[PDB]
Amino acid sequence: DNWYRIANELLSRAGIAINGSAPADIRVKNPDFFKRVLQEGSLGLGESYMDGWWECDRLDMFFSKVLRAGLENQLPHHFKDTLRIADLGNDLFSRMLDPFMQYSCAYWKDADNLESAQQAKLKMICEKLQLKPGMRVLDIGCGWGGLAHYMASNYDVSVVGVTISAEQQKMAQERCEGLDVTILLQDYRDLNDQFDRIVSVGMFEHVGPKNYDTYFAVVDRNLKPEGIFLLHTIGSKKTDLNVDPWINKYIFPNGCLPSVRQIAQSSEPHFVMEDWHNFGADYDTTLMAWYERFLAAWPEIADNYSERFKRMFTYYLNACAGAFRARDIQLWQVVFSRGVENGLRVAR
Amino acid sequence: DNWYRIANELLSRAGIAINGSAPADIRVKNPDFFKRVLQEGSLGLGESYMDGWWECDRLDMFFSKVLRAGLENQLPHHFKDTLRIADLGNDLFSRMLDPFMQYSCAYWKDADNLESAQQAKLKMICEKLQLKPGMRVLDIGCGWGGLAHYMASNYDVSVVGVTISAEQQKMAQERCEGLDVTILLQDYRDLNDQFDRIVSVGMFEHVGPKNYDTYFAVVDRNLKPEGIFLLHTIGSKKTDLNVDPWINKYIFPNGCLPSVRQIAQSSEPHFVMEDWHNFGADYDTTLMAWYERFLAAWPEIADNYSERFKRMFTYYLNACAGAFRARDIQLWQVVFSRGVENGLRVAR
C-alpha cells in the first residue's frame, strides 16, 4: 500500500532496508508501523519502538543515516504540516555515568574511555575559566556536584552550586564534604551576589528561549566586573522551537535547544563573546559509552525498571547519538567576559 | 566655559588630564577644540587632531582609556542624539607590512615580532582549513596574494584568488609566479564554481549587513559538499550600523562591522558554526607594530605624502589600537561547514 511504498522510498534514500539484515536495517513486526510513523512522526517512531512494533541492531546508525539524508524533511508536505501544528534513579546513573557523575558531554580529544574523557572535560572547563587561588565560583545547575567537587579539589577556589533537586543537593553536599563548597536549593534567578567566575552546564536547555534575556541578565548581575562566564549547552543548528516530540514526552519535558543566533542576541548587551567551541561529535561517543554501560548494568537494575523502560532508554541514547553523529545537533562551550584587557587564549 | 568644564569632567573619568604631562594626557593648542569635539563627536576629534589643534604622546593609551570609560556614551544626551542622526600606496605598505603583505591581524600567541606573528596567522588559517594535497581553495578578497602565496607554497593545493583592485591582481600574480594560483579580477558574487575550501580575510567588513545573506549564499554555492569555510573579520560587540564617522570619511568608506548575532543569523541556513575564535587583543599589538614601522619608514616616503596625511594615519593606527585594547572591537576567525562527520578539532 501507499504507506509502505512511501516509507520504503524514504528509507532507501538513507540506505536503510525494510526487513534487511544490515546493522542499520529495520525489521517490522506490526505492519501498522508504516502508517503510524508517517502520520505521527517522531512520536510514532519512538512509541512504536517502545511498543515492540520494530527492531534494529544499530539504532544509532539508523538515526545517523536517517538524519543525514534529512528524511524528516523529505517527508511529503501534507505529513510535515500536520506535525508542525502539534523517571531515572541513582541506581541507574551511578552505574552508567563516570565517578564524577557527569550527565553531560565528555571530551574525547585525547581520551579512550568515558572516565578519562570526563576528567578531560572537567579539566578543560577549569582551564578555560583561568582559576586562581581564592576565587569564588558559581555553578548554575550543579547536579550531583561533580564539577564543584572537581574544581574545589584541584584549584584553590570556593564554589557555590545551585540546583533545583533536593536529592541532588544532598548527594552533592555529601560528595563535597571537606571542601569549600556550598550547595543551594533555590531558583537561580533569585541570586544577587558577586562571583569571580560563573559556569553553567546542562541547565540552559531547560530555560526556554523566551527567558534567555533574563538568564544572561541574572549571570551579569552575579558576575564581578573582570569575571568570566562559561556556558556549556547542547545546541540546534536552527532558530525555532527546537523540541522533539518524543524527547519532550519521555525524557526532557522542558527541553528546548538554543541556536547560535539566540545565544548571540540574548548575550550581546551583557558580554563580549570570547570563544565558541563546538565538540558535538564527542557527544556521540559519550552517549554510546553510556549505552554500553547501561547494558552491562541492566541485570543489576532490571527489577526497579521495566522492559518498556529499557526500550525507551535504548531509543533515547541511540537516537541522540545518531543526531550528534549526523551533526544535526551540537555541543557548545561559550566563554564570555565584559572585555577583559589583553583578551583570553581559551584552552582546548 | 561649559564646553571646557564638560570636556574636562568626561576626560577625568578616563584618567586624562587636559594639558598634563602623562603619556595619555592631551595638550590643547586651539581652545575651540572643546566645543568642536562635543558638537562633532568622532569626526571633530580626529579632524581637529589632523588640524593640529591638540597633541598627545600616546594616542593609543588615550583611546584605550577613553573607550574603557565609555565616554562616547557618558556624553550628555543632547550631544549623542544629534550625532546618531548623522589614499595609500605600495611605497607605504611594502615598508609597513610584513613580507607577506598582510594588511590584517597577526597572531602573537607565540611570536615576538610582526613577521613571525603574520606567519603564525597564515599557518593557523591553513591548519584550520585542514588542507590536503590536490585541494582547490578559493580566497575571497585576496589582496596582494600573500595568503595564496603562503598556502600554495606550503601545502599541495590550487588557489583561486579574487580581488577588485587591478593593481593588487598584478602584484599578486607576480608574487605567485611558479605556483598553481589564479588571481581573478571580478565580483565574487558572480562566482559559480566548486571549491574544497574557501577563505575570506578582510572583505566581509565592506559587504554591508544588508548583503550578509547574499554573501553566505555565494559561499554556499561555491563550496563542495564536505567543504570548509573560514571567515576572518573584524567585529563589533553590538548589532547596529557599526560605522565610525571619522574612519568612514578618511580610511574605509564602505566599512561596517558585523556583530556575532548578524553573522549567526545570516549563516544559519547555510552552515554549522564549527568554531569561533576571538583574538582582538592581538590586533592592538599588530597595529602598534605597523605604527612603529610606519614611523621608521616616514623619511623614505614623506615626499609622496603630506604632514596632514601623517597625522591622519597616526590617528587611525593608534585609535584603532586603543579600540582593540579596550576590547571595544573584536577580531574573529569563524570556521563553518555543513556538518562534517566526526567534527573538527580546530587548530589554535
From Swiss-Prot, chains A, B:
One of its GO terms (cellular component) is cytoplasm. Keywords: Cytoplasm, Lipid biosynthesis, Lipid metabolism, Methyltransferase, S-adenosyl-L-methionine, Transferase. The active site is at C320. It comes from the Bacteria. Pathway: Lipid metabolism; fatty acid biosynthesis. It is found in: Cytoplasm. Its EC number is 2.1.1.79. Pfam families: CMAS (PF02353). GO terms for biological process: fatty acid biosynthetic process; methylation. It is an enzyme of class 2 (transferase). It catalyses: a 1-acyl-2-(9Z)-enoyl-sn-glycero-3-phospholipid + S-adenosyl-L-methionine = a 1-acyl-2-(9-cyclopronane)-acyl-sn-glycero-3-phospholipid + S-adenosyl-L-homocysteine + H(+). The keyword Cell membrane does not apply. S-adenosyl-L-methionine binds at residues 103-104, 137-145, 163-168. One of its GO terms (molecular function) is cyclopropane-fatty-acyl-phospholipid synthase activity. Transfers a methylene group from S-adenosyl-L-methionine to the cis double bond of an unsaturated fatty acid chain resulting in the replacement of the double bond with a methylene bridge. Belongs to the CFA/CMAS family. PANTHER family: CYCLOPROPANE-FATTY-ACYL-PHOSPHOLIPID SYNTHASE. NCBIfam families: PRK11705.1. This is Cyclopropane-fatty-acyl-phospholipid synthase.
